[PDB]
Amino acid sequence: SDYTRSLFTLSGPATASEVEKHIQNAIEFVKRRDPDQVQFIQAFTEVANGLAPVFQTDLKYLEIFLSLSEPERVITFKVPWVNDAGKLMINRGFRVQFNSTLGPYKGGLRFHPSVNLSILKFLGFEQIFKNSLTTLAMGGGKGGSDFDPKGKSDNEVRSFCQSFMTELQRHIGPDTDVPAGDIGVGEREIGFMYGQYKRLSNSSTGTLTGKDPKWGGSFIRPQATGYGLVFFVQYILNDLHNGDSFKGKRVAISGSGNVAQYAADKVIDFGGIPITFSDSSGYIYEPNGFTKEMVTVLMELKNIQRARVSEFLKYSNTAKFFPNKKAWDVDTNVNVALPCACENELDKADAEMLVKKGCIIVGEGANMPTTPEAISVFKAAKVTVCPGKAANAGGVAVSGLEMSQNSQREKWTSEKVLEKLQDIMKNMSKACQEAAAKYNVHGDIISGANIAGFLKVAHSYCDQGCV
Template sequence: MVQPVEPEFEQALNELTSTLQPFLKANPEYQRALEVVQLPERVIQFRVIWEDDQGKLRVNRGYRVQYNSALGPYKGGLRLHPTVNLSILKFLGFEQTFKNALTGLSMGGGKGGSDFDPKGKSDAEIRRFCQAFMQELFRHIGKDTDVPAGDIGVGGREIGYLFGAYRKLRNEWTGVLTGKGNDWGGSPIRPEATGYGLVYYVNHMIEKSCSQYAFSNPSTLVAISGSGNVAQYAALKIITLGGTVLSLSDSHGSIIAPKGLTCEDVKQIMALKLRGGTLAELSQSTGKNKNCKPGPSWTYHAGKRPWTLLERVHVVLPCATQNEVSGEEAEFLVKSGARIVAEGSNMGCTQAAIDVFEASRVKGGSNAVWYAPGKASNCGGVAVSGLEMAQNSQRMTWTSEEVDSKLNKIMTDCYNTCYAVGEKWSADTPAAKNVLPSLVTGANIAGFIKVADAMRVQESRVA
């Protein structure tokens, strides 16, 4: 068997093309657009040379994949993580293209980053790396060309260093990066946006399929993976609404709270993560961990993801990284009573897991699982990034309430689009059957049509 050269990208491409088949069969004129859209418009790769605190020169690989600009400037985050490679960034930029289309805002798709690992680095080292990274990247970005944002390993601190370097290199203040601080061009609720948007999207799924598991019900059991920005704010939102959050995790292990985490627990974890700590520290009580205060109602499970640690769960939100739910774990979640699975991470489920969830949906009945792909359910983050771009263009800042209202509407419109298109093109959901439409089919076809239509109008060769 031939191994894929770019496994993450090929997985994303195969998922899209497989769900497009009913649409392409009825509309063969779109086939050329599919052939074109799967190739990035431009791939930029460069070296990043920076100096550590000992004065030693270090070198890392830097990338920017400018995937598609048919709908607007390239838009997508920068990821700093040792696993970053071209396959991962191509998959992320490809997904971002259709995700951005689903927001209804004028944004193309892109992604970038470096295999630099910020963990264990001093503030000065991270600043020097960001400045060196921007010395090359600044040539290729601009407010009307390419507007990067944060991603894994890139938070407010890194955006500040990158923006400061860009401003000095270009001698201009412009909204070239999103995720900025509120006092210098950022948007209210940008840190919360992906997590909040995920909850807003899932709210509609619950109302349609299993209203007894509303987030306002304390008996609604929610499993969340990850403990970064998306997981934190999704957890806080659900706890505030009244639901019970059973888990959080990181790359080292998981916290399981049978009676539910509290807002105080989540805020403690936020503080821990801000200083680069791990969840393992919460289970320790000596040395540097003496300030951690473990709750009496949760346990830490080293080296394990949450999915097989829960006997009962209703809503599942993968919010860590790609391919974090396997086919075997998906089968366990179905048996555990999961009714909703919605990705807060990008491509959080393997294809095997998606197949399990989709088979459950088609089978129907009281145990059916309804799955939402990340390009739809987690588009709230980039949506508010788009709103930040709009605020920068107007040199003004909207209130938190205004931004939150716009975010809620964007997620509602996205859900309605995915539902309607899924209902039309899901080959396995004829009207005679009482089966929910495929949201992954709806999201893929709706996003593809919007991008393809723009390409076909702008480039006659695509038509």
């Protein structure tokens, strides 16, 4: 029942070495088209290599992957605005509308002086497949500006947000493109942009996500990524570790932001014991673990005071702080590791420590926390690694549930949103295992997440005539 077979030049099975040669030809082609987009080339390389098992079954999938690598539409535009000194400023705005096969373009907006086309293309490309994994009808996109919010008054941010949306509104809509927040775009910016969009469009629709619950926002948004991480690991523990669970397990958490805080809260609900938190200055350790009340104290320190983790020692006599050390160094048995801080935070040496300390599963809350060599250590040790692209998708999944609520003109209760998120992570975990088994890398959830995300997009793309 393949109606698009004739369109593709490459076809049929291939050996592993043949597939790498074809992947190299694809990477070179991407290089020639965009010679200096370093981040985008690297993202294409990583995703392609993660799909090698699929390409071995049929090389047509590599051709589909290459055709998806070209964005459907990119809009770059001048943004004029007047600052509080009365001077004209000009910034660059972007919206990369990468793929809409499974639904409207979906993806955050980043306001940061480092923003450029290469960065937004790399984030938008990966966003296609993370959004695919949520099982929701969402395509992939990303946008933003080189506008730097730092040092700017509230009114200057309002002026820029209004000018930025004056152009962007022409290209977005509730069934077309639904942007969201990112670095530099939080509740303040989403509100300013929503007001401008509503005024110009003369409509109240779900054209942005991350909105305040008072006007179209959703519950569980702050907790989504941390909770979704724990839901995913809990389901992987049951399915792959023969009925195991978080109950009674000591959990080493890195990071102390929203992902780490709310992952800790859900671990406690499941009976686990979170023992560590961390930041760039060091890590704190509670030998008998953190309680919900203790996590609340930490949340106030990080979210209100924006303090270092060492400050928690003022509130707990049992807590110990270790400067310039990672959470993985803690001297105690650790049964579960949840890196929720930043990319490359868990390296080869960290993985070797955790294996000896008794770690059975790793759950990635941050993006690409585990180094390639650390993943090799865990694979050899038979320690399951839950990939971030599936496990940390709770935030975008709730963004889709926000679109659903706006489409339904109904605000769900917090309990209903939480049930929907857990069920999404349940279905996502099953899809990863099934994809891994079908392609003969059983138990490789990292491969299963790459395969499941890509294949739904690829098959639908051919269903739709490859346009």
